[PDB]
Structures are given as C-alpha cells and as structure tokens.
Amino acid sequence: MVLNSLDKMIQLQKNTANIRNICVLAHVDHGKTTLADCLISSNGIISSRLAGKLRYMDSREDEQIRGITMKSSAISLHYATGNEEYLINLIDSPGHVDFSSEVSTAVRICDGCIIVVDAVEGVCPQTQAVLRQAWLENIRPVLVINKIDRLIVELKFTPQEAYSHLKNILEQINALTGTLFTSKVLEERAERETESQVNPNSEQGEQVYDWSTGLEDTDDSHLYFSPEQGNVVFTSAIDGWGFGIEHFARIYSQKIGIKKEVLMKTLWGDYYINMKAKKIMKGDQAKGKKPLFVQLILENIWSLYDAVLKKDKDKIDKIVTSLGLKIGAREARHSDPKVQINAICSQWLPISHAVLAMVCQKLPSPLDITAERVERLMCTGSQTFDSFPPETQALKAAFMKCGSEDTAPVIIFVSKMFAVDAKALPQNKPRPLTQEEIAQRRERARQRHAEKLAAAQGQAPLEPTQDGSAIETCPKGEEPRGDEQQVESMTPKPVLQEENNQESFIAFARVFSGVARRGKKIFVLGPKYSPLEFLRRVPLGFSAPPDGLPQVPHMAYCALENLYLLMGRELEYLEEVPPGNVLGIGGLQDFVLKSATLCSLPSCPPFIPLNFEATPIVRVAVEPKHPSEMPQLVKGMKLLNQADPCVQILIQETGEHVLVTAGEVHLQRCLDDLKERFAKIHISVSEPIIPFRETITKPPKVDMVNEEIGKQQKVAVIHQMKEDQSKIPEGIQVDSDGLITITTPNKLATLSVRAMPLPEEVTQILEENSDLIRSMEQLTSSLNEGENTHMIHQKTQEKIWEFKGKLEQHLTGRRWRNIVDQIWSFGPRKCGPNILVNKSEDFQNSVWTGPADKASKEASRYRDLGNSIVSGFQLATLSGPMCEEPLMGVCFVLEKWDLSKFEEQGASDLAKEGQEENETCSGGNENQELQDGCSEAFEKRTSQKGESPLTDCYGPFSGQLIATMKEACRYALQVKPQRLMAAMYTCDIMATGDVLGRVYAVLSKREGRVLQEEMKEGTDMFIIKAVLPVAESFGFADEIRKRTSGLASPQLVFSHWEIIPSDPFWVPTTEEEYLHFGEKADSENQARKYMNAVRKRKGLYVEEKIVEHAEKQRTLSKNK
C-alpha cells in the first residue's frame, strides 16, 4: 500500500525475506541526504511524499542545521512491485568521519549494508575505512555507484568518458573488497563480462535472433561482480531520477527485439555496436568507436532535463513516446516547475525494485546471518561457548537457530541508540492506549473526531460560547477528515503537544531472538548479570531462575510491554518479530546496561563488554560553567552515554570526569552534543592539546645499572644535557643522569632500577591489551590456573619465579608456554604497553607475595612484604616521568632488593614511619611490647619475630613503602633524558597532483614529514603518505575536506608513535648552560605544548602531592 497499516506491516515482517537493515555510508553530506530522500519518496510508506522530501537522513534537527550527521535512527521502507512486497526497515546511519565511534557502532547493529561511492569525487575514504572494520561482521553490502548524474548530465560530459571513469571506480572497489574478502571473481568478470557468450564473433549470430544470452545463473554475492545477480544499478537522484544499467537495458529492449538479459552483459562493461541490426560485440573498435550510450538512451536524458525546466512540452512528449514517462499537466499552473520535474521522473526511472529485491532474495529467510553472528560479537562463554546449543536450554537453542518456536523474552543488541530526551521531539506521546498511533490515530480520525462524537464533545457550544454564532446554527459536520484524500497525511491533531513524562527515551535496537508474544518479561539482576559471566570459564551458570542455584546480586523480574519498530516518529506494536529487524525498548531506559546486554533468559550472550575509545586516549577537561549546574552536568554525561557511546563519568584515571572519543576529530564533535538537550547542561572546556608520552633511551653509568650506553662525553641522545640545558646535579664526565639507586627506611627497603628501551614490536603487541589481569586472575573470564596462563607468558615474559627477566628473555627467544602465579603489574592499570619484572635474589622474604599470590616455596612461605612493589609501580606508570601524563616504550627491570638492615640503630626517617605505624622501630628484635601496627604484612599472616630471626616489618609500613615506590621510579627516570614519543598517524590523502604540493605546504606547518609521495596509475587519485601528529590536528582533516572535496580526501589511518629528539620538562633551569647552546630542551619548548598542563583534567590532585623518606643522606647513612 502507500500508508502501510500496522497489522499488514507486522504480517509482512513475519513473512520471509523482509529485513536486512542497510546503512547508506558516504561523506558527511555530499548530496547523500538528497539521494536518500528521493528514494524514500518513491517508496510507499507513511503518506509517500510526507516520508521523503528532506525528512530522514540526519535524524535530529540540530544535526541538519549543522551539516554534521551524528546519531542513528530507524524508519520503515516499503515498496510495492505488484504481487511481491519487500521491506528493509532502514537504519539511517550517520556516515561520519574517520576515527569515529558512531559509524563503526552503527555498521554492526544493522544486518545489511549499501556502499554509496561518488563517480565525480571517487570512492569515499571514510566509507572504506569503516567498511574494513565491518568485514569482520556479517553484512550484505550491495554496490551502487552514485553521482554519474554529475558527470553525464549536470557537468555534461559524453557517455564514452563515463565508461572510462567507471573503470577506475571499479578498480578502487576491488581493492576494498580485497582487504578481508576474496578478489578474483571481479577480475574474471572484468576480463570477460558474465559467464556465457565467450566469443565476440558469436554475438552477431545470437543477437539478430531474440534469445536470453549472457547468463550468470543468478548466484549469491556480497559486492562481488556477477553483474550483481543481473540486477546491477547505478543509484542517482537529484531531481527524482534513478537510472541504472537495468533501466537502460529495459529501454533498449522495447526499441528492438534483443532482450534485457543481453544488455546486463554489454552495458555494464565497455561494449560497442555495428548498427546493422544492433549487433553488439567487443570488436568494431578503433579508439572507442561507436559506444551504445552516446547514440541513444543517455543522449535523451539531457533532452528531457532541458525540456522540463522551461516547459516546452514537445520535447517531453518525445521521451514519453518510448513507453510512458508522463507528459506533465496541471502541476505547472503558474509556470516555475519544481515538483513537475520529480513527477515525470518517478514513474519509470527509480531503482527501488532492483536493489531492495537484491537485498531480500539473496538470503531466502531471516534465519541465516542473525544466527551466524555470535562469535563475531561475543558469546556466553569465552572458551566453552554456551550461546551455541551447548548448555542445553530449549528457548536459548531456538533463538540461536533464530526464528524461535512461538515465544521469546527478546534479547536486544544496543551499541548505539537514538537521542535521550525529557520531552521527546522526534517521538509521539503514547496517549491513545498503552502504545500504537500509526493505525489507531487513523481510526480515531475516522470515528471519534467526526460529527457524531465531536458534537457530543462540544462542537455546537465550542467551549460554551453562549449568546453567539456558535449555538445559533448548532454545527455538526459530515465526516470532517483528512483521510483517503492526501494519502492519510492529516488527521485532527496529527502531531501531539509534546509533554514532559517518564516515557521519553527512544530506541530502535536489533533483535537476536525471533518471534515473541506481547507481555514480554525481562530480568534486572546485578550490575553485570552474574549468571552470564559464570558461563565463561567452566560452565557454572544454569537454566534455573536467577538468584537460586546460580548466585546474583539484586535480582528483579520486570514486565516490559512498551517496544516499537520506530518509523522515525510514531509508535507500533510487534508480536510477529523476524530475527534481524529493528525492535528496541520504548519508554523505559532503566532495565538495561552497556557492560552486558539485556538479561531476559538466565543464560544469555553478553554481546558487548565495551565499544570504542581512541588509541592515544584523547581526553578533555569538562567543567561546570556555573557551580549550581554541576549536578546537572554530572547527570547529563550519563544521559549522553546511552545516546553517544563512551565517556568517563565514572571509573576515573584522570579527574572527576572527562569526555572521551575514538579520535581527535571526534572529540570536538561530542562536546557539541554535551550542550544540547539531556539535563539542559552547559560546559566550559580546557584543552591544552591532546597528550603525548615520553621514552627513556639513555641511563647513566652511575650506581647499579649493568646494561647502559652512558660514557664520559655523550650525556644525552643529541649533544649533551649541559649544551641542551637543565638537569645537572653532578658532572658530565660521569654522565649528569646519576643517583638512580636510593635508600629509604634505614636499609629496610633498599632498591635500584633500570629503564631501557622496549622493542617496538613488543610494545605494539602489548598495546592490544592481551596481558590482562582479568584473564590471569579473578572470576571475570578465562581459567586462572589452566591453559590460559601460558598465553600470557607467550607475549609477556613473566613467571611464578623470574631470574632472567623481560629484556634478556625475549631477545634470544619469544613465545614460551609457562604458568604465571606472580605479577608486578603489566602497566598503570595492570594492563598496557609497559612491564615490571623482578630478577632479585631472596635476601629475607623479599620481592614476592603480591595481592592473592601464594606458591609457598620461595620467600620462606611467601611471607610479609612484596605487594608494595606491585602497587606502587602502577602509580609510577600512571604519572609521567616529570609528573604529567603516561609514558610508553620502557622496560623496567628490578636489579636488586633488600628487606633487612644490619645497622641496628635507626634513623629520623624511620622513626616517623614507626610512629605512624604505632609500633617500636627495629630491624632485628631490638624491643619488647607492641607487636601490632597498621602494616599489611601483619594483616596477611602475622609478624616475622617468632617464625624466623630478624623482624623487618617493624618501622616501615606498607602504605609508606608503596609511596616510596611511586616516588622512586619517577625520580630515577626524571634525571635521565626523556625523549618525546609523539602520537602520529600517516595521512593517506587522495587528491590531484596539481594542488597536493599546496596541500603539503600547510601540512608542513603542523610538524609533518613526507615518508612517500607517489602516483597511483590505475586510479584517478594521487597519494602522499605523510605523517601528521594527533594533537596538532583538531578539526584539520574536516576543514580541507569541505574546502576541497575530491582534490583533498584525507583518509586517517594510525600506525605507531614516532619518537622525536625533544625533552619536555617544567621550568628552564640555568641560562648559562643555554648560552653554550645545543638546542633548547628540558624547558618550555615545542615539546612542552603537548605536556603543558594536561595533568589537570580536574586531576587526581591540585598539581602533585607526594611524601618521601629518601631525603637526609646522613641519618640513613648511605653512599647512594
């Protein structure tokens, strides 16, 4: 139909081949919106024209105003061929820029896809970048080459050139295909079009007769060329057009006897014609002699276009006289045609019948790709896999297989949902009944608002206006409606007055479960849903009710009877659900989580632990503008979290709260969102650019360090530290980086440290975060002492007992399989591209016994201290070497450690510590009374007085030890030269060579360097692979792209952090040094731009709070 009622719609959905949500990915807006709207208009859904015409591509009004597509939203797309009926349920994905958490998220929600590429701007890089991630997810991307309307008609180039242009585009697409899918069929096709008709001479003897030659046996395909199942089509629509190869073929078929299947082969490629009886062949060529499009078909489209604007009419008629394109009358009454152009086009042009059909029939039922995608997202178990038929439940099995029996609680999938509200501008209020205003409203318009119940309400009085012309005549209408005249567009009160109410949150989602019944129950259990988690590792979860045999906190069983399809606006029922269509939670946004997906059965697959943050971890200081608005601000972040994915409002590494994104360009975009809507929040921002990291590539030759490159002349990496300036505690003839060993509690915790360069490959490997504490320890996932610990060992060379270490071990041999039951943290949060390893000897219960580690062999019986080391390392790593932001590419190795003293007098530093503890100070049973303090060792497993001789927990308590650790490492690495590891990416820009020189000039000003400038023979593009820092681009790629689209298309792709010779440090010390002159470093610099005040995103402290007991060398009695 044209409206499509609710009941009908549901029925259609229930029928097979009526899903696969396509995205429409391209630039931010190149005419993408325009392309969309025309198609929508053409399709028969919610009043035809009211659905289309600048309504649905950018979901929100704000977005539209901006020209910045951000959010996703679902609509209905219904076409009527005649007998058949297709359905997409179109998710309008944003098509946003590179390094984005909106686009990627969108792509894996939607079951289908569609690639919009430009024939006058080349293939879109953004689309390509995201698609490559989307090849790891199951989708059905149909190729449609767009904006040939620009080349052929608007700019007006000949159809010979069009063919030439297309080849390049095809080549580009091939490349894209070849990243993670196969790319040989395409090549074959290119070589010889279709399967049948292999010889060009034979086409003379087969096309003079009327036969269906040039077959492909239809065949299933993603974007692979078997001329797209013989239904290949160019999409193009700027004034109501469609075009398509198929359309062209059809036209040809009507002129002369050669059939449509003949022209699927020839019109796709570059074929030519004799024109004796239209004998099409590969031959009859000199230098592109006699192409098919220049003589007929694509000549007449120009004629048509000219005709319709001026309104000659004769010209129009000629075109019509082929079959029936409509002449046009009674819609250009006062001249000035606009809709007229559209109307003539929309009859025989559009390609809704080709593409939708293709989307549908390639998978004969909705049970194929919905069932398949579970291991690609995330299963119920990490290693056991219980989302699959294992762990036997009838419903679970059914909904894995997809389709279900005839009942389902419905497990949704939500990486990204539509705008959170407290009013609902793009959603109606469900005032008529609990739900439904798509057919219900129509009914109301028909019956209630007609005279029979309008009059009763008050049409004769009109809110009692007595003694007037209201009650004089006493009016009652004759079915006052706007139904069945303007395709059911207007009813009495169509758009409701948007009220404030609890049920204002909007969602479309995607369903894993098949058919469901109205009256849908959902379980709200713990903060992660524990039964699901139990099924990771060995299966300890069951099919029994939550909080019975399987344990779980909270426990609650809710009844959700508010779910809808979402046709942009309006509500709809659904108890005939196909597996794959959109069907999200309605008024409620309370009974769901992003850490684990909706719990409905006891055994479910949690599809998403977490979405996507940036690779550099781009942060920003979000602050209250007003102090009284702080609470609002706090609230607002949470709200945003559901709509726009990923922010650090809770669980903090830096500050009270910071906004985070998938990239530098996207950070800015998300700060726009945190002003509009939510809790009416408004922010002030402090961005001293995006933070970089440091590397230690040169220690001294002073105190305990075996492996080093220090001498008595080369002090720094370039020049000396004296010639650079600052950081000169001792002389340059023994290196000015010394004093790396220290003593703290009068020789009860003496230590040295060694910071050497970690191999780049190793760093890269570690940065993928597969050295996880959650894998090795805890009951989150994976076996704790089985087969998974070997994996950890394989990447990071750490063990239960280590005496070789990391740096020595992985050089000679990597990929060992051994158990790991002792850690000293794998970074600042027990994960990241850093590592600590201890090869220290057992002095007396030293360097072992961490948090929850007991082997009972070395360190006597794993006694006393050792946890301190584990703790403080993290603290050290989180802060920079000079108290700013993290440092990477460093291999920490503990050379020696001692817990006991044999001085037996004490110290000033020690005394204070002892006092704090509330215990008498000693290092060998010097005292009686007070055998209890506040140290952790005591708590764990008592003192070490009675167990063994010499007690060395008396005095230095655990907290203080931890503090010392935090201090000491930092100190060691501060005095050393700390080279700037800048976060850079290579910019795969695709432009023309004429303006790339100029483009490159500006790139140079952002501290960029060319690695390779080369020419791509095959495509129309010219390529530079020049590096570009992440911080110095802050809406850089967005400016050049819009300023010049096609002649500057920057594809942003990460690689690794380039290290440059510069040392960021606070305060320039001593200008005498500078006066010698060997560059300016360890001072205010170009490098300190990145490390100026990025410490404070509100921060852990005001600047830096730390206490130490390493001071006073005489009381400690040390030579270090």
């Binding site: 024209r49 009454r333 309400q457 009109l462 809110e463 012309s469 006052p480 169509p494």
Partner: protein, 224 residues
Amino acid sequence: MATRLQYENSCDVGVFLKLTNKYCLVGQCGSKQFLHTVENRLADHIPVVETSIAGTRIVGRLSAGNKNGLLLPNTCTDQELQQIRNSLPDDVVVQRIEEKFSALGNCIATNDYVALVHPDIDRETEEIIADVLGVEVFRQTVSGNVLVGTYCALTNQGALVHPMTSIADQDELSSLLQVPLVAGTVNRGNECVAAGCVVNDWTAIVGADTTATEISVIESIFAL
C-alpha cells in the same frame, strides 16, 4: 511547489502582501521589483491591485475574505474602496465594515463555507461580516491568543497553527472547520505563522527565512 519571497528584504509576506483563493492585494511600497515579481507569478490568473490599503503599506493584516466576499474596515476611504473594487473583478462584494472595533485579517480567518472570528467583535459587526461573505462565522479563539488569521494560516486544502495550540481546541477546531489543523511554524520558529506564509490553493508563498524541511512540510500540508 512553493516559492521563497521577500518584501523590503524581510521574511514577512503577509503584511505587505495578501493572497487567497483569488484576489491578490499589494500596497505601493518603495520597492517596485517585489511588486513586479508577484504580478509575474500570477499572470493571467490573479490580478494584483497595486493599491496601498487604508492609504498604507499594510494590506494582508488589514483585510479578510477569500472569493465570495472581501472584507475591509472603516479606516479605508471611499476613494480607496473604489480603486480596490476597480482592480479586482466586480463579481465579489468589496464592502466597508461599520463600527470599527479591530484590525481585520488578524481576527478573521476564513474558508469558502465558514469563518473563524475574533471573538469579542460586536454582534452587529459580526452579522455584517457574515452577510458580506455569505459564509458562516464561528466564535473561537486560538489557545493563548485572541488573534486568528495571524496564528492560523487558514485555507481549504490545509491549516497551519503554531505548537502552543492545545489538544482539545485543535481537535474541535478541526471538527468545526471540516479541515485538519497541523502543528508547525515558519521562519525558524517564528510565532506569527500566517504573516510568514500566505496560502492560495494552486501556489503557496512564504518568506526566505524558512528551512528546507519546514517548506517541504508546509507543501505537504496544503496538497501541492
């Protein structure tokens, strides 16, 4: 189809300009180009008067009616009236309303078969108005306001009203009028919708300040 027109570089095309099912009136503004354009648009269709109504630039908000009768207040001179009569066809009744108690157009929205009145206009006056057109008159405000024809772009094919209109009134307005009322605005959320766009059944005029979506929405409303 809909065209985005200015007057004195403004968004308002229902103060200087008047447009109904038939008979277009414009006041002799200093700018002639804008006068010409309208004429060009409505060539051998609707005659423009090019006559300053009440001797003044205001026209759309100082006149009511469609094409059965046509309304004018007492402020207008006899001479003024005569010119107007001459300009338009002499089938319609152009007639002066006695006992001025309001500026007509802001208080008289109307269709081919009924009319929406102030209300608060006097009974005799109302009767006169009824007579002049032939159509009925129905006493009802628009929720919040008392000026209708300003906050209700009333024609046969569709009716635009701002979002401040209530649920019940709108429901019963529609019933009364036998045409639905649609919530919406023009000129980036301008409160005065009817000055923003003047509506004839065949072609719809609007200001330059509307967005691409708004215009589309209005087009869909009036069946164009």
